Design a binder for this molecule. Sequence first.
Ligand SMILES: CS(=O)(=O)NCC[C@@H]1CCCCN1CC(=O)Nc1cccnc1
Ligand SMILES: CS(=O)(=O)NCC[C@@H]1CCCCN1CC(=O)Nc1cccnc1
Lengths: 304, 304
Amino acid sequence: SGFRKMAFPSGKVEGCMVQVTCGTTTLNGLWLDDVVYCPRHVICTSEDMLNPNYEDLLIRKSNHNFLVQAGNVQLRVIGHSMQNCVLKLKVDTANPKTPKYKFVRIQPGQTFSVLACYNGSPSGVYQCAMRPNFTIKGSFLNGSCGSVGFNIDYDCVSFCYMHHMELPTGVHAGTDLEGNFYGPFVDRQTAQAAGTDTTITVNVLAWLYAAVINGDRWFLNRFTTTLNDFNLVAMKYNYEPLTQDHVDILGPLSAQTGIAVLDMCASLKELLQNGMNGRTILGSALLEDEFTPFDVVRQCSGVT
Amino acid sequence: SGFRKMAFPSGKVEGCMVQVTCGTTTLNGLWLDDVVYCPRHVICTSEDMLNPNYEDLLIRKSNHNFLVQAGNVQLRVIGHSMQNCVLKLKVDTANPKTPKYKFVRIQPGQTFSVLACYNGSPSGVYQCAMRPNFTIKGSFLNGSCGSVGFNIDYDCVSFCYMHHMELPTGVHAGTDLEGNFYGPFVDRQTAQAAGTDTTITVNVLAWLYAAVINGDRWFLNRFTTTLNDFNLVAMKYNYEPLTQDHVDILGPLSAQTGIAVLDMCASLKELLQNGMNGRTILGSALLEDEFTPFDVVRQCSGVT
Ligand SMILES: CS(=O)(=O)NCC[C@@H]1CCCCN1CC(=O)Nc1cccnc1
Ligand SMILES: CS(=O)(=O)NCC[C@@H]1CCCCN1CC(=O)Nc1cccnc1
């Protein structure tokens, strides 16, 4: 009973967080095996951030200039390299708490947990989604850079995000663990505006299935629709187009509830056109889109 | 930038979760020092749950009937006792991962993180609040009993909740770590209806301060009110009465933003009377009440 915005247990990732300092800038690093990954903007001063030339700035940096501390103990840096927008600091000690891990690059609409850190110390964990405009709506202050996003499949942590910046509008941008930004963003203090933050339709549908499974059924109507008809309405409301791949992904939820995917689309179409009328669904007055179909199945089945 | 429903990092609590089985019932236990705490209903069969006599049922149980497994290894039970609605199983091994801890009994309106577990294995973490009717709106399935709620102050985990049951309406009830239920609930499969789930006014105000700090200011109006005038409106909307103690607790948020607490009350009064008009505050279409003033300060300051 009940449906909550749930993050993965963060323990495995807490065991990887370290503090990285270069000059007067301190941010977070991810320590996996004998490598510490961190945003390359750790080498910048506030005056460098306006138009940094990372290759040039890195020439003035040596291994001993990167101070890495895990807990209250210092790690010895024996190498450093830049891969895209991340620095990889080779240390002389493999992280004894390194979990089984992968680096994955997620697609928009995919959700993940963020372990927000400051000074290499965890402050909290929350669930995010990669928006269709490649931003994330996180909760990050100065010092949170290097905090990571991840998913866990039993005992393997798939790291998908590393926090790099906040845009002037308060939304967030970062990279995968190979240092490639999600979206068109760059690690520079410049005019970077996000595109349209459309709603992740397949995720809203998954959450409507979660509401039916949990007893919230008032929005179920007597209508059906087609993908093309639904998509005409979805476009109008700034919702992402629904594809047959999304319908296939919702199949297990459709099977468990006996509600055909296109019927749920028609209910969603009426919610968009009529509004909620002061009513709530799973304690929310808006259509939640940061639960994937996989998250709904996992939460409704108790996957550990 | 940004404000998220954030849970505490769960690592310290993950190191305490064990599986407890008695007969055909398997639930979760909390292993701190050489004691495993778990709901006493682990001794019940589905036929016992209708009108259980826990003292009588416990007579038929011996130490060897409680199977405790931490990871894939079995713990030896050398004693057992019932304290209120929890069982304390003494084991021969102190939990090597026992963090610094306290057992606290929270008041309604207080928030906490829940590490939802099944078979002693963590599945997810989310943030909850003890409702004014002493229920919690969690996400718990069969097997989640024994999952705990907690707060962390630097390195000391204060355990405040242990999950025991779901009411027929899908809301949740549990105890503190001394086995005393929050509210009038009992660990019996019987007619237990919750009282009015009023809104935690002081928490809504704290979240409105968080919205102002994060740029969402559209709801700020040109009015002020008094505690008595505000409370007349609060009663009408099923909001908890606001006291001078709550005003004092909001003082740091009032100071940081320069918005007098009573002025924020007047903004909240207008939001109640006029509604949101299709607008959102911190990405929500309803007034969020599961952030305490302390949570707002902690998140807005980056406490680790
Ligand atoms: C906001 S801006 O005028 O576009 N300049 C961004 C500043 C630089 C641009 C280059 C990379 C470092 N940031 C710092 C940064 O974004 N820190 C931060 C703070 C809060 C939340 N998240 C991260
Ligand atoms: C729902 S009732 O008809 O009031 N009976 C409650 C059953 C017994 C009553 C006595 C204690 C054990 N529960 C089982 C229980 O609530 N399990 C569960 C399941 C999902 C979420 N959370 C917990």
